[PDB]
């Protein structure tokens, strides 16, 4: 970290993954269209 | 009422309720309490109904309010609240969250409302209550209207109980060529209706009953009955006769060209002139239709037609119905060879979107009223000079200008400041930027208002503060860069004359100060000029307009102003003592805005903005310019001399009584001069240095700023503990900007000793406080005020020094934390 000491360390903030033995897993918004069930609360589309 | 939010589904019923409540409010034989209750109900309903649903009520108010009778007092307040609440719904391009965005028709109604109210108020006699109720409404409507809104239905003619009276079609004659078109278009319209029947699945039959799905009159034109042929022609006859009555000349260049066989009309597209043809022709259809429903209203003995409102007021969707048929008639004239001409009054204006913007017309009206104000001010001066004539032929104009225009300007150009300052390159505001014409008009407005108030503050009396505030707002909304670069010579000369007159007035005030015209100049310069000049200089410096605005004649005028304000430093009059702060602020702003290093004339040769470079030696002799920038005025010491003097005084430990001019004028001027020229001198970020550039015209470095900050700190330290020192806060505020360039050595050199002195003083005062607790009654009561005063002076000193320290800490806290510093720790302890 490049600015943790300047701001946050003395304020008492802790790095998000400070005591994790492994890197934090991440997810991303994949733009591959996929078929999913029509939500039961969809604001526009209803299936009977 | 709160339950009416979100009632879009029952929009028709909500609209009917609003209309009924409005009609009840406009009721005779109603007591005052009853009227108050009805008005409260209407206001409560409009406070919660969505802005989109109030469109019909707005349409009714657009026709009722402009009259400005006694029944318009409540509509004015209703509109004020509505627009103050839903200004985003109309102004912002995105609209208001969850409410949507306005429509073109709603914006057109808003503009019509604004201009109707404005015209009625301008032509009305002064009425305190009416003006007090109408000014907020005008301000709200103007603030809601987008500055660049262009009225699609813009009508320079703007013609016009409602008048459904149409033109005299029946009395006016009908050409035989127009009659031939009448017959052919009757055939055409029968074929069109037959095609519509085909769309509806309606064939030829014996009656038009829906169930049979037939049409008894569906046969070719030849078998078409003369009675029904005449029925079809008669609307065409009336339309063409209306056109003739309007003096619209129709020229038949060419000739016109069961199963329906209607020729297509989509082939022809109406031009702008043909669209206006159709606009007025459909408006006349609506007017005739209105005369009819007026006949049934008279027969019924009452009632009002819902769609009686003029076409422009009518929503476009409602217009479209008669729109189709009117445009069909006009287009069929066209392909029958009939070209109709009127001589449109809007043809001269063609499109001119810039001239059609709302802000453009608003500024045009403001400038016309500026001229009217010049006239009545000249008349007032003449009468107060010779002849005590109290008729006051322009009393209404005076009241309008002082009670409507000034607040309107104040609010409008406060709200839309960014629109007038944005440029195509940089869009400061949300969306849209003022045109060059609008910027020129606002500059002309500022200059004209300044010239109006010049040496005439007493004439305005209690409105002088309003005039000065409006001048402040206009100056902060002025786009001087663009106006001076690409603008008419008239407006450029206006701005130059403003600066020249300001310099002349400052010179006269200075010479008078160092010792009725004296009083006039003193009061004017103290109340209007100096504040407005300071605001203008600050605006120029903040927007970096100095290198483009202050050149040539403006540069000479600013030179004179600066060189006189500084020359006002060899006197000690009580008047000078009282006026020094304003002069110092003005000089600081001028030093920030000036594009020439007036403290470093030796390097002026490397300046492209200096007049001695812009103007050839053949010029500058046509004027009175000295031979050298050094002789521009030699009464201001060079930068080195000024810094040496300030340092010597600070080391000597003199007091404010010994240095009144240096603390109030010189130091504030330097605190703005040094930061400006550090960015353009050596040691500045060189991103443009690789591009061929001359050596910097200044020698300012971080050392100069550090020395000045140290000297200021030493002066405050020397004047610590004085009973009365109000200059400390001003000096701290002026020195704040130069702290970002302070060197690390400043901490130990100046800050540590100063805060140590302050801490020691605080400890002494707290010890006296404790001894006071040890004391009793009269001993306790007395001395309490003494320690109170000691704490007051200590608080003054702290509020003078701490703000400088906070900026210094913010710029060095990173370094201190990265590398522990014993000096920083000691400062923390103190």
mmCIF file of C-alpha atoms in Angstrom, chain A residues 5-6 10-11, chain B residues 813-814 817-818:
data_model
loop_
_atom_site.group_PDB
_atom_site.id
_atom_site.type_symbol
_atom_site.label_atom_id
_atom_site.label_comp_id
_atom_site.label_asym_id
_atom_site.label_seq_id
_atom_site.Cartn_x
_atom_site.Cartn_y
_atom_site.Cartn_z
ATOM 1 C CA UNK A 5 0.429 5.183 6.362
ATOM 2 C CA UNK A 6 -0.273 8.765 5.269
ATOM 3 C CA UNK A 10 -3.317 6.325 12.364
ATOM 4 C CA UNK A 11 -7.067 6.775 11.854
ATOM 5 C CA UNK B 813 1.851 16.000 7.011
ATOM 6 C CA UNK B 814 2.626 13.338 4.406
ATOM 7 C CA UNK B 817 4.367 10.819 8.742
ATOM 8 C CA UNK B 818 6.613 9.097 6.192
#
